RNA sequence: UGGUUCGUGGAGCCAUGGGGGAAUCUGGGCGGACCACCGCCUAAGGCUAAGUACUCCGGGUGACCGAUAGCGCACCAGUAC
RNA sequence: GAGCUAGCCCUGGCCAGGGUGAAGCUGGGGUGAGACCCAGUGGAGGCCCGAACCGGUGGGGGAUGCAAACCCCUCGGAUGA
RNA sequence: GAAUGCCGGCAUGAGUAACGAUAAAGAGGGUGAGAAUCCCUCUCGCCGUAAGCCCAAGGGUUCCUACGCAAUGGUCGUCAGCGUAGGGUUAGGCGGGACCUAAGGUGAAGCCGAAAGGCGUAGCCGAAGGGCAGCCGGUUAAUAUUCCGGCCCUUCCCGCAGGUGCGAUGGGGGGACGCUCUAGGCUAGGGGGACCGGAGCCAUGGACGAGCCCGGCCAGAAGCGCAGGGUGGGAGGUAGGCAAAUCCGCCUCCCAACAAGCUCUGCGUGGUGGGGAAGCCCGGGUGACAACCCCCCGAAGCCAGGGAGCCAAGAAAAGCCUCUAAGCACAACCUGCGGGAACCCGUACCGCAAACCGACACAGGUGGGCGGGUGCAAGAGCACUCAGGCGCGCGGGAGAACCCUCGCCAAGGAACUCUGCAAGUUGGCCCCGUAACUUCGGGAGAAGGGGUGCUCCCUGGGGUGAUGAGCCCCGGGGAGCCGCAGUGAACAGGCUCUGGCGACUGUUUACCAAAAACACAGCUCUCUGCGAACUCGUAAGAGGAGGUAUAGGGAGCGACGCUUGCCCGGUGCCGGAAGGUCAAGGGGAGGGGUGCAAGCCCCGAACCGAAGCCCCGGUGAACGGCGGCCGUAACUAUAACGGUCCUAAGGUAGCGAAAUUCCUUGUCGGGUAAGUUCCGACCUGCACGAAAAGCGUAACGACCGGAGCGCUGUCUCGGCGAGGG
RNA sequence: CGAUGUCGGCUCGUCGCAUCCUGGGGCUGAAGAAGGUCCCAAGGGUUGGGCUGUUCGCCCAUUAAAGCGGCACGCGAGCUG
RNA sequence: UGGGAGAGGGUGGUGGAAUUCCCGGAGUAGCGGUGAAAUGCGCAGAUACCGGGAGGAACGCCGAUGGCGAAGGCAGCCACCUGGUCCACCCGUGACGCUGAGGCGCGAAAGCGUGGGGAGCAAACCGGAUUAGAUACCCGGGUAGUCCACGCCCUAAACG
RNA sequence: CCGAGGGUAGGGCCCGUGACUGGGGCGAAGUCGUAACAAGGUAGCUGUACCGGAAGGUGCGGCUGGAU
């Protein structure tokens, strides 16, 4: 049947993207935390 | 007159439709329509604030002239009478000798080809508009302003009207559609005659589908819900109300008056509505 | 109403959201209701090192660990997944 | 977190074929004029039968499955909320 | 040594289950260390509204070639979507951007919020919508509307020539719109040809034939032709389209008007460029100087912004045209022609799937287009089959029980069982014929029955032609032939009688309930006079509504028919300027601390002092409620009648052992040989009853009861057979 | 209670005997035939249907007879539900 | 052809008295009702009086034993539209007539449907009396309805 | 071919009968009240409508076949 992951690149970038996170207080705290942890990727990589 | 159908479906047995007999033109003036942004009953937060709205037929909004004292002394010809999906009354397209075209709401008995005009000097005939000072006591009227130059507010739906009952100083006394008696400022404009399409209220939708065409989604009784949802919710099997009948938000709904008491307009309302 | 040890208590002191509303030393605040006496102090402008805190970083040293321990990672780890 | 799901909003798309034959219209009849009746025309409808499409009625199978809801047979809607 | 402890390792179950659709395989030849599994050939089967082809998501080198087989592959492997390496994606015209706007998002001005932030007209961003210039063919191992070939086209810059009051982010036009149905003429696509081109074939009894088999086109500027779309012209006045206007709108006049004319698209033609089958021969040659023509069918596509009807009344903005404003009128713009200029990103491959979502090379899920032929009434249904693609990544045997899916069955025919659960029966089309009841639509495909193939002969109307033949479509009548059987295979209702509940089509517990539940038109109560009530938000701001009492909110009830009684003492709601109670505050009689004092400070009586409550009324489609006992009539029985306690008042009409009845399988009647169920009655209703509506009601229901006919392996009662295990 | 699945039906039995029938007996208010009552006896047998989920029971038509109990109210890693 | 009388019918308008309600004023201890009473209403200011407003229905006098119509039935006043009928002239037509089974139309009140309107009155209903009792007669309240439009119903002591 | 009739199926009319139910007639020796005939103690009768144990009542409109 139809499952939960229906990939959509524009949706991905617009929802979890770098400019999405930076627009908002909680989104920058995500970036601060992910940078503090040493994550190689601060944000999901969608091909574009 | 309203039009019936033969019972060739279970819904056509009861469906009735407006005959549309006064309508002389089936397309709207392109310069007077604009898109009507459908809300679905949702507000600027995205939240439902009026339940069970949405899904109706697409509509363009006809720009109506609810001021009329714009063009004192300038006569206009009644060029057409049109359907308006945004209101129960019909609309009439006016052709001012100015060259300017405007929509008013069509009074009862308005004739295409006749002339109307607005102003303190207008004759007391259907379609003309005057400040209330100059309309004779007893004449029935519509598209009444509430305050001067703020636009027609009262008696706007199909078949409705108000009656001038007398004068008192700077104000005239109107019997509003609801039966209320109200002072209204004499400089407020009005339009002589009743609103047209008085058969509007004899329409029988006939089927659930018809309501849906109009943007009315199904209504859910509180008694069919659960206690999380509604005061009337829950109960094992069916259940009487078991408390004073209440809205989804807990307030009582059988008689509880809700007009604010200290409202400044009370100094102008003589007698609360009848019936 | 808050702060203080003070939770309405005899409840002062310091702060102030509302109302009323002064004086310039013979002016004014405080000494735990309040009054007198006796003292202390100078509100409604601002600044000021040092002694104090912390440990991303550098070093020194362990009756600290020794690869299931010690940091999640001694190794290409905030990786693979 | 509404890329699942629920509702709404904007903008596009889809619905083989067959059946029934409403109003209206034209003609004829009728009448003082009408109502109305008959025929032809017509093509209405949360109309009918049935694929796509949307479903999930009863049974059987499956049950460390092909599958964390599937398969076969049957069955509901299919111009409409 | 134990914590169903934690991490790791290794056992048991066990050579067991399984190896992922029952579309299916066999042989020969090759390669190789090794072959059921790789390559090649022949034979067989399966899909063909797909299991074929194209496009968009998503995936991201999986594409091509060489060399490999440790692992990955449910076996094997020499093979591969795997390992290594090299190569491969070419655009002014295709898609997106240097254009437009939609919801929405953002957001100068502005507004609001302790902070963070929330809003917000314009503007901007935002597409699969508007707009915009490329078709056919060839070529690579792998790209092609991109390279090449032929023929076309767009914008920008500059110049030349003619022309004009030129000029805009401003004004106006236009862009610009629904659903259903549909005309004319075309194109796509298809069928036939005794005609045109073609390598060949004559088998096994016959045929050298009007034989078989194969193919008989594609693109194309201007011009022309056919078919459609769009659009009236002139003058005069003008106060409106936030300036101006010659434009547009309005009034008037005059010609024109279903015409023509001007313009635009489609189709045909068209210089020109291409393609080109079967067979044969080792993807390529040949066929071939290939031929390339006539007839019929015909779109849901095209002309298109076509036409009609209908109510639920159907985006925006830019491009485009027109008007004028500053300005500028050696400029500028318009038209023609010529040269130059023309950027960025995508393009491989998979794409109903082994490359996407499902941990898997997973019987599941995935939006748009093409989707041939014949026959069956039609069709995208069904059977077979074309092009194209496959035989589903374990096999070989055997022929037990049992299981699964399937076929048949003597006599009986529901006796099975909770229940005909399941499975039979019925089954399309044409004709005949069809009941109660009914809201006059229906019920209805009611029920029930007859016909159905092929052959010859006669014949009627239509379509295309031309009026004819030919082709295609719809029929009619007569006489015959064969079989058990003619929708001869496949796809295709079993029917009726009678209750309950719900009017109806719809909706629901994604994944145990589809229903009598929710919704529904419709009924009533109630609130709301507009800066509405009400909802969201601290607010600003929104929704309501660019609506205005024939409207909007809340509640119950639930088509329709006939109806909806009595109780306002309690609670609710509504009304009541009296009265009672009533907090802060006002007031300050009187009292207290302290001071030598004037004075400072504290307590405090009467009285004044809101809403609310109390109090007085009203109100039931507001919350709710709606009795008991004794007695009485020519036999008994019962009680129309009287008496009496209690209550706010004591259940009306209608219905009743009921979706409600405990006693209960109540009693009586019907149906059955026999009926705890069913239907009809009665009424001592444990414990119906009138909008948590009462009683009915045609039609409707994958709802739940009861009965009958038809027919059956459900059964007496079992047997045999098939295929996958 | 870190789980001992439940009524009824179907299937499959096996056992007890306080015996329903068949076999053997005593008594009889046993003439015969038919019965009554008690004793011995468990080898075998103990039907098909209507109602109801029912066990049970009632009823129909038969029968030599239409027995009663136990086995986790026998039997759901055997089925039904 | 020329005249007449008339509440004959339909549509649109419009006038005054009275009843009730609301507002203002003034005023106070009762009003109302009956055979007599009580319920009811009234110091929360009634009744009685004056001024203002709203609204519905019916039209006093004229009015008669009268007029009109086929019947039912028709009553303020104005206008429009329209029927029947009588009279005088004796002008035209030339028996064109009478009746009338079926048909069609009309048809008081009550009742029905959809919508409006609602002052007064008033079935049902509630209360007070009366009475042996009183589901009545009398009194205080009161919903349909009574009124308007359109569609039904089609009855009568529709009687002379 | 037709064809007595038989068979399957569906309709129409008539008769008998049926748990139970509606009223009607008669009986009369009962219970309740007294609706009509007199102004019958509320003049009566009436079509209709709503209501009540019963006769009946009330509303609306009509008749006199109504006493004074
Ligand atoms: Mg997942
Ligand atoms: Mg999706
Ligand atoms: Mg993905
Ligand atoms: Mg995307
Ligand atoms: Mg996208
Ligand atoms: Mg998206
Ligand atoms: Mg982003
Ligand atoms: Mg990571
Ligand atoms: Mg890195
Ligand atoms: Mg992130
Ligand atoms: Mg009309
Ligand atoms: Mg109708
Ligand atoms: Mg109709
Ligand atoms: Mg009709
Ligand atoms: Mg119906
Ligand atoms: Mg109509
Ligand atoms: Mg109209
Ligand atoms: Mg339109
Ligand atoms: Mg526009
Ligand atoms: Mg709008
Ligand atoms: Mg809006
Ligand atoms: Mg917004
Ligand atoms: Mg938001
Ligand atoms: Mg949000
Ligand atoms: Mg709401
Ligand atoms: Mg809504
Ligand atoms: Mg309208
Ligand atoms: Mg209308
Ligand atoms: Mg209605
Ligand atoms: Mg609508
Ligand atoms: Mg609604
Ligand atoms: Mg509802
Ligand atoms: Mg519920
Ligand atoms: Mg919740
Ligand atoms: Mg709660
Ligand atoms: Mg609650
Ligand atoms: Mg409740
Ligand atoms: Mg409930
Ligand atoms: Mg309850
Ligand atoms: Mg419930
Ligand atoms: Mg209950
Ligand atoms: Mg409930
Ligand atoms: Mg319910
Ligand atoms: Mg309850
Ligand atoms: Mg209730
Ligand atoms: Mg309650
Ligand atoms: Mg106001
Ligand atoms: Mg203390
Ligand atoms: Mg303190
Ligand atoms: Mg302060
Ligand atoms: Mg001092
Ligand atoms: Mg001092
Ligand atoms: Mg101080
Ligand atoms: Mg101090
Ligand atoms: Mg001290
Ligand atoms: Mg000090
Ligand atoms: Mg220092
Ligand atoms: Mg320091
Ligand atoms: Mg150590
Ligand atoms: Mg060490
Ligand atoms: Mg280690
Ligand atoms: Mg470690
Ligand atoms: Mg480290
Ligand atoms: Mg480690
Ligand atoms: Mg690593
Ligand atoms: Mg759209
Ligand atoms: Mg369809
Ligand atoms: Mg027809
Ligand atoms: Mg028509
Ligand atoms: Mg349908
Ligand atoms: Mg249909
Ligand atoms: Mg259908
Ligand atoms: Mg769906
Ligand atoms: Mg199913
Ligand atoms: Mg089945
Ligand atoms: Mg089966
Ligand atoms: Mg199963
Ligand atoms: Mg499972
Ligand atoms: Mg399946
Ligand atoms: Mg299936
Ligand atoms: Mg089916
Ligand atoms: Mg269907
Ligand atoms: Mg269809
Ligand atoms: Mg439908
Ligand atoms: Mg729709
Ligand atoms: Mg131990
Ligand atoms: Mg374990
Ligand atoms: Mg264990
Ligand atoms: Mg462990
Ligand atoms: Mg462990
Ligand atoms: Mg092992
Ligand atoms: Mg073995
Ligand atoms: Mg084993
Ligand atoms: Mg398998
Ligand atoms: Mg091999
Ligand atoms: Mg090998
Ligand atoms: Mg091969
Ligand atoms: Mg991937
Ligand atoms: Mg490639
Ligand atoms: Mg590769
Ligand atoms: Mg390998
Ligand atoms: Mg190997
Ligand atoms: Mg290997
Ligand atoms: Mg492997
Ligand atoms: Mg595998
Ligand atoms: Mg090799
Ligand atoms: Mg592979
Ligand atoms: Mg290479
Ligand atoms: Mg090119
Ligand atoms: Mg550029
Ligand atoms: Mg833009
Ligand atoms: Mg675009
Ligand atoms: Mg393009
Ligand atoms: Mg081209
Ligand atoms: Mg290539
Ligand atoms: Mg438009
Ligand atoms: Mg559009
Ligand atoms: Mg539609
Ligand atoms: Mg056509
Ligand atoms: Mg072509
Ligand atoms: Mg064809
Ligand atoms: Mg031969
Ligand atoms: Mg043509
Ligand atoms: Mg002008
Ligand atoms: Mg062409
Ligand atoms: Mg060739
Ligand atoms: Mg050649
Ligand atoms: Mg040659
Ligand atoms: Mg040749
Ligand atoms: Mg079509
Ligand atoms: Mg059109
Ligand atoms: Mg409408
Ligand atoms: Mg816009
Ligand atoms: Mg200038
Ligand atoms: Mg020009
Ligand atoms: Mg650039
Ligand atoms: Mg690029
Ligand atoms: Mg490419
Ligand atoms: Mg699929
Ligand atoms: Mg596979
Ligand atoms: Mg798959
Ligand atoms: Mg094709
Ligand atoms: Mg067929
Ligand atoms: Mg067919
Ligand atoms: Mg099919
Ligand atoms: Mg074929
Ligand atoms: Mg296979
Ligand atoms: Mg074997
Ligand atoms: Mg199979
Ligand atoms: Mg058999
Ligand atoms: Mg049978
Ligand atoms: Mg039989
Ligand atoms: Mg049954
Ligand atoms: Mg069958
Ligand atoms: Mg069949
Ligand atoms: Mg029948
Ligand atoms: Mg009928
Ligand atoms: Mg129907
Ligand atoms: Mg039937
Ligand atoms: Mg044959
Ligand atoms: Mg056969
Ligand atoms: Mg088949
Ligand atoms: Mg069928
Ligand atoms: Mg059956
Ligand atoms: Mg039936
Ligand atoms: Mg029912
Ligand atoms: Mg239903
Ligand atoms: Mg239901
Ligand atoms: Mg109903
Ligand atoms: Mg309903
Ligand atoms: Mg329904
Ligand atoms: Mg449907
Ligand atoms: Mg479920
Ligand atoms: Mg569930
Ligand atoms: Mg779940
Ligand atoms: Mg669930
Ligand atoms: Mg299920
Ligand atoms: Mg369910
Ligand atoms: Mg269903
Ligand atoms: Mg539900
Ligand atoms: Mg419901
Ligand atoms: Mg109703
Ligand atoms: Mg709130
Ligand atoms: Mg706002
Ligand atoms: Mg708004
Ligand atoms: Mg708005
Ligand atoms: Mg509104
Ligand atoms: Mg409902
Ligand atoms: Mg009926
Ligand atoms: Mg009663
Ligand atoms: Mg009460
Ligand atoms: Mg009360
Ligand atoms: Mg009371
Ligand atoms: Mg209560
Ligand atoms: Mg004092
Ligand atoms: Mg003292
Ligand atoms: Mg009521
Ligand atoms: Mg109570
Ligand atoms: Mg209630
Ligand atoms: Mg007695
Ligand atoms: Mg009762
Ligand atoms: Mg009973
Ligand atoms: Mg019974
Ligand atoms: Mg019942
Ligand atoms: Mg009960
Ligand atoms: Mg009980
Ligand atoms: Mg019972
Ligand atoms: Mg019982
Ligand atoms: Mg019984
Ligand atoms: Mg039963
Ligand atoms: Mg039952
Ligand atoms: Mg009884
Ligand atoms: Mg309820
Ligand atoms: Mg109920
Ligand atoms: Mg249903
Ligand atoms: Mg159903
Ligand atoms: Mg049968
Ligand atoms: Mg069997
Ligand atoms: Mg066999
Ligand atoms: Mg077998
Ligand atoms: Mg086999
Ligand atoms: Mg076998
Ligand atoms: Mg336990
Ligand atoms: Mg355990
Ligand atoms: Mg366990
Ligand atoms: Mg004897
Ligand atoms: Mg013995
Ligand atoms: Mg024995
Ligand atoms: Mg034994
Ligand atoms: Mg039994
Ligand atoms: Mg029993
Ligand atoms: Mg018994
Ligand atoms: Mg015997
Ligand atoms: Mg036992
Ligand atoms: Mg026991
Ligand atoms: Mg027991
Ligand atoms: Mg047991
Ligand atoms: Mg058991
Ligand atoms: Mg089990
Ligand atoms: Mg069991
Ligand atoms: Mg077990
Ligand atoms: Mg066990
Ligand atoms: Mg069972
Ligand atoms: Mg169960
Ligand atoms: Mg007083
Ligand atoms: Mg008189
Ligand atoms: Mg004469
Ligand atoms: Mg009448
Ligand atoms: Mg009447
Ligand atoms: Mg009234
Ligand atoms: Mg009534
Ligand atoms: Mg009524
Ligand atoms: Mg009436
Ligand atoms: Mg008379
Ligand atoms: Mg015979
Ligand atoms: Mg015979
Ligand atoms: Mg009397
Ligand atoms: Mg009497
Ligand atoms: Mg009398
Ligand atoms: Mg009664
Ligand atoms: Mg009584
Ligand atoms: Mg009475
Ligand atoms: Mg009369
Ligand atoms: Mg008399």
CB hemisphere CA count around B28 (13 angstroms): 21
Q: Which residues are near ligand 42, the ion (C-beta closer than 5 Å)?
A: B 235, 238
DSSP letter string, B174-233:
EE-TTS-EEEEETTSEEEES-BS-GGGGG----SHHHHHHTTBPPP--GGGS-TTT-TT-
Nucleotide minimizing C1' to CA distance for residue B165: G54
- C-alpha B140/C-alpha B175 separation (Å) is 9
- Determine if residue B57 is left, alpha or beta; phi over 0 gives left, psi from -120 to 50 gives alpha, anything else beta: beta
- Beta bridge mates, B171: B168, B185
Judge contact between B219 and B212, C-beta under 8 A. Answer: no
- Beta bridge mates, B159: none
Judge contact between B80 and B110, C-beta under 8 A. Answer: no
Judge contact between A45 and A38, C-beta under 8 A. Answer: no
- Determine if residue A27 is left, alpha or beta; phi over 0 gives left, psi from -120 to 50 gives alpha, anything else beta: alpha
- Helix, strand, coil fractions of chain B, as percent rounded to 5: 10, 30, 60
Judge contact between B71 and B100, C-beta under 8 A. Answer: yes
Q: How far is the CA of A13 from the centre of ligand 164 (A)?
A: 59
Method of determination used here: X-ray
Resolution of this model in Å is: 2.5
Judge contact between B117 and B128, C-beta under 8 A. Answer: yes
Nucleic acid strand E: bases within 7 A of protein CB: 57-60, 103-105, 116-117, 119-120, 172-174, 176, 238-241, 248-251, 310-316, 356-358, 364-366, 439-441, 503-505, 511, 517-522, 525-537, 541-544, 546-560, 572-575, 618, 622-624, 692-693, 698-699
Judge contact between B26 and B86, C-beta under 8 A. Answer: no
- C-alpha B243/C-alpha B231 separation (Å) is 8
- C-alpha B208/C-alpha B203 separation (Å) is 14
Q: Of B67, B42, B62, whose CA–CA distance to B143 is shortest?
A: B67
3-state secondary structure of B112: coil
Tell me the residue length of chain B: 275
| B80: exposed, middle or buried (Cβ count in 10 Å: 0-12, 13-18, 19+) | buried
Judge contact between B217 and B55, C-beta under 8 A. Answer: yes
- Beta bridge mates, B61: B34
């Amino acid at each position: 049947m139809k499952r939960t992951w229906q990939p959509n690149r524009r949706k991905r970038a617009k929802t979890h993207g770098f400019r999405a996170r930076m627009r908002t207080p909680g989104g920058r705290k995500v970036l601060k935390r992910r940078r503090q942890k040493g994550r190689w990727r601060l944000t999901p990589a969608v091909r574009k | 007159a309203v039009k019936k159908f033969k019972p060739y479906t279970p819904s056509r047995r009861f469906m009735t439709v407006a005959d549309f007999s006064e309508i002389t033109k089936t397309e709207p003036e392109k310069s007077l329509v604009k898109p009507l942004k459908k809300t679905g009953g949702r507000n600027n937060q995205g939240r439902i604030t009026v339940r069970f709205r949405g899904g109706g037929h697409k509509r363009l909004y006809r720009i109506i002239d609810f001021k009329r004292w714009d063009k004192v002394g300038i006569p206009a010809k009644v060029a057409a009478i049109e359907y308006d999906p945004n209101r129960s009354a019909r609309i009439a397209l006016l052709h001012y000798v100015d060259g300017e075209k405007r929509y008013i709401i069509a009074p009862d008995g308005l004739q295409v080809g006749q002339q109307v005009v607005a102003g303190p000097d207008a004759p007391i005939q259907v379609g003309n508009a005057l400040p209330l000072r100059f309309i004779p006591v007893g004449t029935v009227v519509h598209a009444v302003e509430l305050e001067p130059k703020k636009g027609a507010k009262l008696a706007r739906a199909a078949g409705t009207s108000a009656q001038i009952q007398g004068r008192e100083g700077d104000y005239v006394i109107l019997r509003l559609p609801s039966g209320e008696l109200r002072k209204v400022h004499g400089e407020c404009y009005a339009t002589v005659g009743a609103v047209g399409n008085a058969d509007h209220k004899n329409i029988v939708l006939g089927k659930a589908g018809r309501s849906r065409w109009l943007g009315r989604r199904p209504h859910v009784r509180g008694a069919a819900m659960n206690p999380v949802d509604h005061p009337h919710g829950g109960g094992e099997g069916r259940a009487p109300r078991g408390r004073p009948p209440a809205s989804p938000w807990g307030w009582q709904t059988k008689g509880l008056k809700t007009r604010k008491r200290r409202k400044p307009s009370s100094r102008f309302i003589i007698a609360r509505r009848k019936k």
